[PDB]
Amino acid sequence: GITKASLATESFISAASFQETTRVLTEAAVAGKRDELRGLKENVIVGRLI
């Protein structure tokens, strides 16, 4: 449902920007997660072309 679905996206930059940023970054930091920037929010954050 919406909130969890947005946090379940395999981009942690989108998950962090949404909500719960502290929790998202600890879980990503421990998993050694790698965000390849497929989404729009991710590209807007790094200031790139959508």
Partner 1 sequence: VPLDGGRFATSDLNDLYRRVINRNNRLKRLLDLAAPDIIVRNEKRMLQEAVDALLDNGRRGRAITGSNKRPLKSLADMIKGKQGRFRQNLLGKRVDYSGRSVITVGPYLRLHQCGLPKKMALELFKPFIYGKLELRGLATTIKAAKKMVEREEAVVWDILDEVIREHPVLLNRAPTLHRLGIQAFEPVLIEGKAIQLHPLVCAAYNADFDGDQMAVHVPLTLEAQLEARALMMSTNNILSPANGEPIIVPS
Partner 2 sequence: IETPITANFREGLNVLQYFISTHGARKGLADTALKTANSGYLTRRLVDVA
Partner 3 sequence: VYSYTEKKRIRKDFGKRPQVLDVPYLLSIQLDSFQKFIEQDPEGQYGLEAAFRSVFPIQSYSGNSELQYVSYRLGEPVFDVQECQIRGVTYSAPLRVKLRLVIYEREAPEGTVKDIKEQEVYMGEIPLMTDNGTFVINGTERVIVSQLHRSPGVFFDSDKGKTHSSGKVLYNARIIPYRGSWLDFEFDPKDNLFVRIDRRRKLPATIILRALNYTTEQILDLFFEKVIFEIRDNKLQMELVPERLRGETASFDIEANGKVYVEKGRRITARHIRQLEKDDVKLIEVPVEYIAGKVVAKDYIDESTGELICAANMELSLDLLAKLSQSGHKRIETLFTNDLDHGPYISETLRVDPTNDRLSALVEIYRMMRPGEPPTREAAESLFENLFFSEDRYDLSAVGRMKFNRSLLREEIEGSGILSKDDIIDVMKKLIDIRNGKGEVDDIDHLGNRRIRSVGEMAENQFRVGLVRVERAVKERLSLGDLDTLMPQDMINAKPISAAVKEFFGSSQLSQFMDQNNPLSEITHKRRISALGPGGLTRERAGFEVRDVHPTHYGRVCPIETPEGPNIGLINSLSVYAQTNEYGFLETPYRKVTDGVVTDEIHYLSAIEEGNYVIAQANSNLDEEGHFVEDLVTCRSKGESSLFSRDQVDYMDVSTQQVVSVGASLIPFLEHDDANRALMGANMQRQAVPTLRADKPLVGTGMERAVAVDSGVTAVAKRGGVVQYVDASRIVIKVNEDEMYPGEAGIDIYNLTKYTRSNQNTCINQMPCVSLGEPVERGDVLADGPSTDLGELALGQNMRVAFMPWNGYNFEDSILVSERVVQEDRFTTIHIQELACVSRDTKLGPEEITADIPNVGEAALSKLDESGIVYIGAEVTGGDILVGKVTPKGETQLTPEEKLLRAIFGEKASDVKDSSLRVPNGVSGTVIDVQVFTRDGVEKDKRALEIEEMQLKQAKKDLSEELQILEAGLFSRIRAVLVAGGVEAEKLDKLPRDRWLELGLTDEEKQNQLEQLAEQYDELKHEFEKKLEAKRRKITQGDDLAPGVLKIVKVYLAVKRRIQPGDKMAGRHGNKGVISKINPIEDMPYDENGTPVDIVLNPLGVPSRMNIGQILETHLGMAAKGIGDKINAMLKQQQEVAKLREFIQRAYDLGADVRQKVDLSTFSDEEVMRLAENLRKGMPIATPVFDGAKEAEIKELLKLGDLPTSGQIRLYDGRTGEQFERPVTVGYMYMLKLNHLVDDKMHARSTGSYSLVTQQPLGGKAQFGGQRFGEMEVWALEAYGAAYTLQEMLTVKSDDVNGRTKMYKNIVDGNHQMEPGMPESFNVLLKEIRSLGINIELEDE
Task: By CB under 8 A, name the binding residues for partner 1.
Answer: 16-17, 21-22, 25, 41, 44-45
Q: Which is nearer to partner 3, 7 or 35 (CB)?
A: 35
DSSP label of 38: -
The encoded tokens of residue 34 equal: 């790698």
**The one among 25, 27, 37, 41 contacting partner 2 by CB under 8 A:** 41
Residues that bind DNA (CB under 7 A): 1, 4, 19-23
The residues near 28 (Cβ < 8 Å, ≥ 6 apart) are 12, 15, 16
Tell the smallest beta-carbon distance from residue 27 to partner 3 (Å): 12
Q: Which uninterrupted H or E stretch holds 7? A: helix 3-8
